Each structure stands twice: as C-alpha cells, then as structure tokens.
Design a binder for these strands. Structure first.
Ligand SMILES: [Mg+2]
Ligand SMILES: [Mg+2]
Ligand SMILES: [Mg+2]
Ligand SMILES: [Mg+2]
Ligand SMILES: [Mg+2]
Ligand SMILES: [Mg+2]
Ligand SMILES: [Mg+2]
Ligand SMILES: [Mg+2]
Ligand SMILES: [Mg+2]
Ligand SMILES: [Mg+2]
Ligand SMILES: [Mg+2]
Ligand SMILES: [Mg+2]
Ligand SMILES: [Mg+2]
Ligand SMILES: [Mg+2]
Ligand SMILES: [Mg+2]
Ligand SMILES: [Mg+2]
Ligand SMILES: [Mg+2]
Ligand SMILES: [Mg+2]
Ligand SMILES: [Mg+2]
Ligand SMILES: [Mg+2]
Ligand SMILES: [Mg+2]
Ligand SMILES: [Mg+2]
Ligand SMILES: [Mg+2]
Ligand SMILES: [Mg+2]
Ligand SMILES: [Mg+2]
Ligand SMILES: [Mg+2]
Ligand SMILES: [Mg+2]
Ligand SMILES: [Mg+2]
Ligand SMILES: [Mg+2]
Ligand SMILES: [Mg+2]
Ligand SMILES: [Mg+2]
Ligand SMILES: [Mg+2]
Ligand SMILES: [Mg+2]
Ligand SMILES: [Mg+2]
Ligand SMILES: [Mg+2]
Ligand SMILES: [Mg+2]
Ligand SMILES: [Mg+2]
Ligand SMILES: [Mg+2]
Ligand SMILES: [Mg+2]
Ligand SMILES: [Mg+2]
Ligand SMILES: [Mg+2]
Ligand SMILES: [Mg+2]
Ligand SMILES: [Mg+2]
Ligand SMILES: [Mg+2]
Ligand SMILES: [Mg+2]
Ligand SMILES: [Mg+2]
Ligand SMILES: [Mg+2]
Ligand SMILES: [Mg+2]
Ligand SMILES: [Mg+2]
Ligand SMILES: [Mg+2]
Ligand SMILES: [Mg+2]
Ligand SMILES: [Mg+2]
Ligand SMILES: [Mg+2]
Ligand SMILES: [Mg+2]
Ligand SMILES: [Mg+2]
Ligand SMILES: [Zn+2]
Lengths: 181, 118, 23, 112, 83, 69
RNA sequence: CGCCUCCUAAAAGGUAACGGAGGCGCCCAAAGGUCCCCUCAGGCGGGACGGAAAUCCGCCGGAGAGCGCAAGGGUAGAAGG
RNA sequence: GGCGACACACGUGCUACAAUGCCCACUACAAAGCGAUGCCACCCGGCAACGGGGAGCUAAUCGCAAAAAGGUGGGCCCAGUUCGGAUUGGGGUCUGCAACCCGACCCCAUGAAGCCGGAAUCGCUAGUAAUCGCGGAUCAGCCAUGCCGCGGUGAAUACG
RNA sequence: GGCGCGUUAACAAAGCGGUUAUGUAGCGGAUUGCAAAUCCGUCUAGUCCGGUUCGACUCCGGAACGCGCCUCCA
C-alpha cells in the first residue's frame, strides 16, 4: 500500500477524533470506508450506439479501473429497451484506488463543480452509507473539454462499516466532505 | 471551463471571447484587458496562462458571473412573485413586465401562437 | 443596426447621446 | 316547471339570411345572460348559415331556476335594422322565434 | 424612477397616518387613494386599503417590499385567464 | 487487477490556478486545474464573494428620512 | 372427433355424461453434454438526468421469482443465472 | 381606476435576418424650419443620461447643428455571429403635485425570434423608385417606428 | 336460440403487435363587393370487462348493442 494523502488523514486525524467523539472500546468498532462504487446509468446507448466504450474509457481515466457493463434485468417498452441491453457502467473501488479517487474527488472535483453549495446532508443510507450524484465528467481532473463528446454524469456510493448515520456523518465530514446544511 | 466555469472560444479576440461568458458584456469585455495589461486584439490560441489566470482571477472575483448571476436574478423575480407585486404576477403568468401592449405582440414573452377556433 | 441602442447608429436613429455616440 | 332546466329553441323567422343572423344575435344574448345567472349552457343542435347565422339553434340552460327565468322569452322577436345583406341601405324588418321547453324525462317504459 | 435627489415620495397625508399611529399604539385599517406611494419602514406592520378604482383592498405590508409602491399590490385588472 | 485492461496509475502533480499543489496519484503525471479546495469560496470559510450583502434592500435604503413628522 | 394439464374421481390404480376450465399439432445448434462459479421475487431507505418500473448501494426477504409455450407436479443442498 | 387588458385573428409601419455588411477612429457636402418660465454657445463635475455654472440671440448676427449616406484608415471572417436588438434583472437621469398600473432617456448585465418569408399581394415611369440622414407641427414629458415637410445619393424597364 | 360478421374521431370508412390512414366536414389563412367553388395550411380516435405480451385499436375469452343467415319432419 502506498502513501495516499487522504489515507494518511484518515488514520492520523480521523481515527482518534471518532474514538474521542464516540468512545468505541474496540479498534474495529471505529467506522471505516468499505468501498466506493461508481455507476453511470447511461441507458442512452441502449440501442442508439456503442457510446459506452468511450464512457468506460473516461471512467477508467478517472478511477484507474476499467468498469463493467450493466444490463437490463427485464424488458421495458417505454424505455425503448429490451431485456439484456448494455445500459450502464459500474466500477467498484476498494483500498488505495478508493482513497486516490476520493482524494481527487474532494480536493479538485467537488470544487470544480459548477455552482457548488455542498453535499446534501440528507443523502445518508439511513444505515451509515452515503450516495451522491453528478451531472458531468469534466468535473473530475483527468477529463478535458477536448476529449469530451457527451455530457454524462454518474451516481456515487460510499459504503462504511459504521452502523448509524451519525457515525458515518462524522466519518465523512472528518475526511473533507463539504456538507451544505 | 477555461474561465468563470466556461471554456472560451479559441481563434477569437480576447474581448469577444469574454462576452462568451454569462455576465460579461462588451463594456466588461474591455475593462479587464486594459486593467490586466492584456492585449485585447489577439487570439486565445496565443495566450500565456499567466495572463489567463490573471484574467480568470480578475473576472471571477470582481464580477458576479455564470452561476451566481443566474441565481441572483432568479431570486429577485421570485421576491416579486412572493410579495404579490405587479411584476411578480406578470412573471408567473408569462405576460410582459415593462408595460408593453398585449393585444397583439409579446410573442417573445408568450412563445409561439396558440391559434384559436372561432 | 438602427435599434441596437448600444451602438453609434442605434443612438443616431434615436437621436440621443451617450457612451456609444457622444456630443 | 320553473325550477327545472330548460331547452331553448331559436329558429330563424321571416327575413331569410338576416333572420338567421339575428337568430345568432338572440343566441349569443342568451348564452351570456346564462353566465350572468350562474347557469350552464350546452348546445344540442346547431344549423349555421355560411354567413354566420343559424337557421335553428337548440341549447339547454342547466341550473336551478332556468325555466323560471328563460320562460319569458318564448315568442317572436322582431328586428328592425339595415341588414348586412342589404345593399341599397334600406331598413328591413325580420323576425326570429324563441321556444322555451322544460327539460324532459327519458322515463323508461315497461309493461305492467 | 423619480430621480433620487428629490424626496422619496409619500403623499404625506398618509405617512402621517402611519406615524401618528406609531404614537397612538396602532394598528388600524387605513383606507387610502395614494397608490403612488413608496412603502417606508414606518408602514411595515399596518393594514392599508389600497383602492384600485372600484374597491378597497386590504394590503398588509412586510419587509421585502419597501421600495415598491402601495398601488402595485392592489391591481385593477381582473383576468382569470382566457378560455 | 487484470492486466492489459487498466490505465496504470502514476504519482501525479495536480495544479490549481492559486499555486495550490496536491500530492496525489492519477492517470496523468500532471494536470492543471483552475479551482481547488484551498481557494474555493464555499471551502475557505464563508469567503463571501461580492455578496457581502445585508440584502441590502430595502428598508435599509435609508436614502432620505427628510420626510417630516 | 387425436393428444396434454386440472377438476369431477367417493385419500391405491382406474372410472362416465353434448359435465366445469385450459392448452398441443411447436421449439432449441443451445434452450444440448460436462466442469466451475453464482442465487430470486418483493418491501424500505439512499443515488444526476431517470419516471411506478432502466442502472448503482445498504438492510430485510426460503422462495411467493425463474424454469421457451397450458396446467399440475417438482425445484435455490437447483431443475433457475 | 380604465381608455395601455390578451386563448386569438387582420391592416398600416418600424427593425432586421448581414460582407455592396457590421463595428471603431478620423474627414467631409445640404436644404427647410424652430427658437425669451425659449434655442442654447463655451467651460467644469458626470462612462452617460444630465447636473452646475455661463456668453450671445427679441434673432441671414446668437443657437438648435452632428447632417447622414459619403470619404480615408483599421478591425470582425461567414459563425444566430463584432448579424439582430427582443426580453428581463439591477443601478441611475428628467419631467411633472404625482412615473405602480402607465412615460421617456442613460448605464451595466441579459443577446430572444429571425438564414429573406406558403396560397397570395402593394408601390413606383426620372431626379421617380430604392436608400440616406435633417426639420417642424402637437408638446411638461412622451410611448413618433406616425404625419407634414426638407435636401443628399440615385437606377431599372415600358415590345406592346 | 344457434352460426357468421361488426363496434375506430364530426360523419362515412381502412390498414396495422410498436407508426399524422383516407374522403368530406370543421378550424386559421388566401381570393371574392360578399357567399359558394377554388387555393395555402390544420385537426379531434378505437364499445365495456378480464386475460396474453416488454408493449394491444390491433391477439384471446366474455358481456352489451347492431347486421346477416337458419329454426325443418311432424
Ligand atoms: Mg480504542
Ligand atoms: Mg436522511
Ligand atoms: Mg454501514
Ligand atoms: Mg456576455
Ligand atoms: Mg426595470
Ligand atoms: Mg413601450
Ligand atoms: Mg399594456
Ligand atoms: Mg342585395
Ligand atoms: Mg494500484
Ligand atoms: Mg377414435
Ligand atoms: Mg394425435
Ligand atoms: Mg383416485
Ligand atoms: Mg385427485
Ligand atoms: Mg378411492
Ligand atoms: Mg395398473
Ligand atoms: Mg369424461
Ligand atoms: Mg457450431
Ligand atoms: Mg428447455
Ligand atoms: Mg436448461
Ligand atoms: Mg455449458
Ligand atoms: Mg427506491
Ligand atoms: Mg429509481
Ligand atoms: Mg414457482
Ligand atoms: Mg415468460
Ligand atoms: Mg401460453
Ligand atoms: Mg384610444
Ligand atoms: Mg409603426
Ligand atoms: Mg419645438
Ligand atoms: Mg435638434
Ligand atoms: Mg444567439
Ligand atoms: Mg433558429
Ligand atoms: Mg450587434
Ligand atoms: Mg405612466
Ligand atoms: Mg451579437
Ligand atoms: Mg448567413
Ligand atoms: Mg423578397
Ligand atoms: Mg404615371
Ligand atoms: Mg440602411
Ligand atoms: Mg414634442
Ligand atoms: Mg423625426
Ligand atoms: Mg336472438
Ligand atoms: Mg377497424
Ligand atoms: Mg364512424
Ligand atoms: Mg377504403
Ligand atoms: Mg386486412
Ligand atoms: Mg382527415
Ligand atoms: Mg379541410
Ligand atoms: Mg377555411
Ligand atoms: Mg377501446
Ligand atoms: Mg394490456
Ligand atoms: Mg388489454
Ligand atoms: Mg397503441
Ligand atoms: Mg378496442
Ligand atoms: Mg373481442
Ligand atoms: Mg324434409
Ligand atoms: Zn486553488
């Protein structure tokens, strides 16, 4: 495992504040990050084209990971979509690639967001997990306006071993998650 | 997002390019270039990022732009909406605000014509 | 154009003066 | 009677094309007066002239008291004016008729 | 606008009625005709019956409407739409 | 990780316009951002921009009070 | 008018009526063999476009899903992916 | 308070859709009128609208006054744009007792529809049509892009 | 009662498992002294109930109404 700026910050500064603020007796009771799972629910390339191959190309430039295709569980007429069409891209980030992703997410990407008023403090799982969406891909550093060709955002899932929202609210904010209210 | 959260057209003049951003008219187009020591009549395809960030820092600090402009005006009309002032009514129903006639035109304010039978 | 009040000819058309057509 | 809904039968009288036009003047007059009474109107039978009038119009006035109010209109209404159809500028005397009928029961028939 | 180097206009038979009542321990419903009047902080709180040509409209006044006139909030054109 | 499919990560030097520099890892060895965390208005406290308001409407106009008592 | 499923059928099998209800006259080159891996429907909360329902995360959920097509039986300790 | 409304429909015009053009700087050439709670020179504060001063003129004398297209030079490069100027927000000026309904003008931002217009249809035969700017009446101010005028530049075509 | 066919918008009437039918009318415009004719445009849908299907005006079953045929020898 390599030195990751946010990884250090978790261990040196976030760990003891949580123990302090919550009082766990066991070094494993203190909440952690489990994984970050990114999902572009593209669904436009249902039949229109093979535009996914470019989005998996960019999602790999952002996370360092080639994502996997998601396909339609059933068939939907109104969505103009049959069962089994490639309709999205999921990538699962763990360990360092998870850290390295959020480090850039919080430091440069969430700032470079247009008209940013902070993350919604109400998007917590109800069981200690958090989810936020996005509208673009140039928000992330590695995506230039030259290479862009379509405006595709994503959903972001951050999973924590915290049992409650309040334990997870503290864990994320102590890492650098700008919460609106 | 070159400046103010918007990429600005290349192969164009830097005063014209700044107009290609929400909140920068021709009067503000020149204001920076003189007050930033920046040659107005040259491409964006030949600019150092010293001038660029000098230009970017100038316009994003001095001037309410892109998002903040849009939201602020968006809030101002809303106050007239809330209180029940005449301009607030005429902002709801899509009628004019500045006292124009309505018997005929206003089509910009009222979209394409809703032709009627009878 | 003669309606663009922010120009020389626009102010000419309206016959008024300002930053764009001064006296 | 007085409280039930009403059917109004407007028919062009002597006058030809101008009687039919006047019939439409009588027609619009009643539809408006219905509004200024909280009454609901609905057209059941309309026979327009290509000039804008009606050789016959039949409409209901729905609302408590329609036959109470509209009943005083059943008769012949005379117009005296210079018709839009006149070209020598003369005054013609045309007529339109109004018929006021209380709304009926579609009562079902079965054998005793 | 009425140019600022003049006095911000109030018909001054009305601003009287709003500060003569700040003394008296208000508040009343004051019926007016000077729609042409800028709202002042001395009016915030009262009820004024801004005429509109036919009827007296109760127009309470709040703290988001100071610069605006009394006659804005008493329109005169009943519309409802068309159709 | 599977070979041949993933864009290899190298130590990166992202760069904001404000001279802020971030020791991270990325697909590019250097990027040049224009906004960052260290200078974002929402981030650097309030850092209230040109909106140091007070509204400043409208009772606060106080552009008069000459009107008599 | 032949064939299949259920009931009638009286707890083995069988059992009729111009009795009550459905279906078949195909299909699949994988929808076949084997080895390996995997587990549903649905409910709640959460998440840009994105909705009742597209894809993503969490929790609950033994089978009510799925098994090409009727019905029944069978079935996730797989026959399902 | 309304005559200024607005699901709609028609007439008369304005402004456009651009390169024979737009923009900016600089330099030209008219006529007819108006002008004493009036024209306003000139100067200062003002990006400006204007505000402060302040000559001359009862006016072939003083002023409105810049005429404008044009001429020269420079810029925009075919892009719903250095076309277009609608809509709206905000900040001001002026008149007038009073600018909400409902005025006009300036400044900042906003930059819409519109790529030359279906069936159809109007004007004009020469200094005319086209285009260009200027004045006046009414008038506190102005919703005038209207009307009555004024000159600048200046064609095409008429077999029949 | 049996058997066959049908129900679509203002009317008449079609195709279709995914889709401005069409004609006439009606509606806005043109033209005309005006109306018609004509010209430029434009437009409202699938009888109810229940199934199949990703999806039903369209397929299956029933109802309701309408049409057509038959009801003979005892
Ligand atoms: Mg411990
Ligand atoms: Mg919550
Ligand atoms: Mg958790
Ligand atoms: Mg701009
Ligand atoms: Mg305004
Ligand atoms: Mg106007
Ligand atoms: Mg109006
Ligand atoms: Mg005659
Ligand atoms: Mg690695
Ligand atoms: Mg046999
Ligand atoms: Mg057989
Ligand atoms: Mg048995
Ligand atoms: Mg049995
Ligand atoms: Mg037995
Ligand atoms: Mg046996
Ligand atoms: Mg049997
Ligand atoms: Mg083979
Ligand atoms: Mg099989
Ligand atoms: Mg199988
Ligand atoms: Mg196999
Ligand atoms: Mg949900
Ligand atoms: Mg959802
Ligand atoms: Mg089952
Ligand atoms: Mg199936
Ligand atoms: Mg079946
Ligand atoms: Mg009038
Ligand atoms: Mg006009
Ligand atoms: Mg005069
Ligand atoms: Mg003049
Ligand atoms: Mg545009
Ligand atoms: Mg367009
Ligand atoms: Mg322009
Ligand atoms: Mg007004
Ligand atoms: Mg433009
Ligand atoms: Mg072009
Ligand atoms: Mg033409
Ligand atoms: Mg002649
Ligand atoms: Mg011209
Ligand atoms: Mg005048
Ligand atoms: Mg004039
Ligand atoms: Mg029968
Ligand atoms: Mg049919
Ligand atoms: Mg029919
Ligand atoms: Mg046919
Ligand atoms: Mg057929
Ligand atoms: Mg048709
Ligand atoms: Mg037609
Ligand atoms: Mg027609
Ligand atoms: Mg139906
Ligand atoms: Mg169905
Ligand atoms: Mg169905
Ligand atoms: Mg359908
Ligand atoms: Mg049907
Ligand atoms: Mg059927
Ligand atoms: Mg016989
Ligand atoms: Zn920075």
């Amino acid at each position: 495992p390599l030195d990751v700026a946010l990884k250090r910050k978790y261990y040196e500064e976030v760990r003891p504040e949580l123990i302090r603020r919550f009082g766990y007796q066991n070094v494993w009771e203190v909440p952690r990050l489990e994984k970050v799972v990114i999902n572009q629910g593209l669904g436009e390339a249902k039949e229109d084209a093979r535009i996914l191959e470019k989005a998996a190309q960019e999602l790999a430039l952002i996370t360092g990971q080639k994502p996997a295709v998601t396909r339609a569980k059933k068939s939907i007429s109104n969505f103009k979509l049959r069962k089994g069409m490639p309709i999205g891209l999921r990538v699962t980030l763990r360990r360092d690639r998870m850290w390295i992703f959020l480090e850039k997410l919080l430091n440069v990407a969430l700032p470079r967001i247009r008209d940013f008023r902070g993350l919604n403090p109400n998007s917590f799982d109800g069981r200690g997990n958090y989810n936020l969406g996005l509208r673009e891909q140039l928000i992330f550093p590695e995506i230039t306006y030259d290479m862009v060709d379509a405006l595709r955002g994503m959903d972001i899932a951050v999973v924590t071993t915290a049992e409650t929202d309040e334990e997870a609210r503290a864990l994320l904010e102590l890492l650098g998650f700008p919460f609106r209210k | 997002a070159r400046i103010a959260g918007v990429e600005i057209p290349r192969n164009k003049r830097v005063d014209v390019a700044l107009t290609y951003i929400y909140g920068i008219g021709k009067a503000r187009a020149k204001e920076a270039l003189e007050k930033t020591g920046i040659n107005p009549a040259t491409r964006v395809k030949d600019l150092t990022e010293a001038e660029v960030v000098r230009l970017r820092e100038y316009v994003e600090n001095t001037w309410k732009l892109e998002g903040e402009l849009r939201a602020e005006v968006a809030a101002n009309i809303k106050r007239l909406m809330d209180i029940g002032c005449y301009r607030g009514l005429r902002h709801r129903r899509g009628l004019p605000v500045r006292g124009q006639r309505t018997r005929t035109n206003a089509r910009t304010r009222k979209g394409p014509r809703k032709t009627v039978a009878g | 154009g003669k309606g663009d009040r922010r120009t020389r000819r626009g102010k000419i058309w309206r016959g008024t003066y300002g930053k764009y057509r001064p006296r | 009677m007085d409280e039930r809904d009403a059917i109004v039968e407007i028919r062009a009288g002597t006058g030809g094309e101008e009687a039919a036009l006047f019939a439409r003047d009588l027609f619009n007059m009643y539809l408006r007066f219905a509004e200024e009474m909280g009454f609901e109107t609905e057209v059941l039978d309309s026979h327009p002239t290509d000039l804008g009038g009606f050789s016959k119009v039949v409409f209901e006035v729905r609302g408590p008291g329609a036959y109470g109010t509209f009943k005083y209109e059943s008769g012949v209404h005379r117009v005296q004016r210079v018709p839009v159809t006149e070209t020598q500028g003369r005054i013609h005397t045309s007529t339109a008729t109004v018929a006021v009928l209380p709304k009926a029961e579609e009562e079902d028939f079965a054998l005793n | 606008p009425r140019s600022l180097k003049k006095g911000v206009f109030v018909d001054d038979h009305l601003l009287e009625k709003v500060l003569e009542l700040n003394a008296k321990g208000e508040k009343r419903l004051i019926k007016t005709w000077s729609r042409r009047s800028t709202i002042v902080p001395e009016m915030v709180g009262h009820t004024i019956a801004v005429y509109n040509g036919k009827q007296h409209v109760p127009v309470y006044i709040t703290e988001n409407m100071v610069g605006h006139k009394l006659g804005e909030f008493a329109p005169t054109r009943t519309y409802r739409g068309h159709g | 990780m599977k070979e041949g499919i993933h864009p290899k990560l190298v130590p990166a030097r992202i760069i904001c316009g404000c001279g802020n520099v971030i020791e991270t890892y990325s697909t590019k060895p250097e990027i040049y951002v224009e906004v960052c965390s260290k200078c974002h208005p929402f981030y650097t406290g309030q850092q209230r921009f040109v909106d140091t308001e007070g509204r400043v409407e409208r009772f606060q106009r106080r552009y008069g009070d000459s009107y008599r008592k």
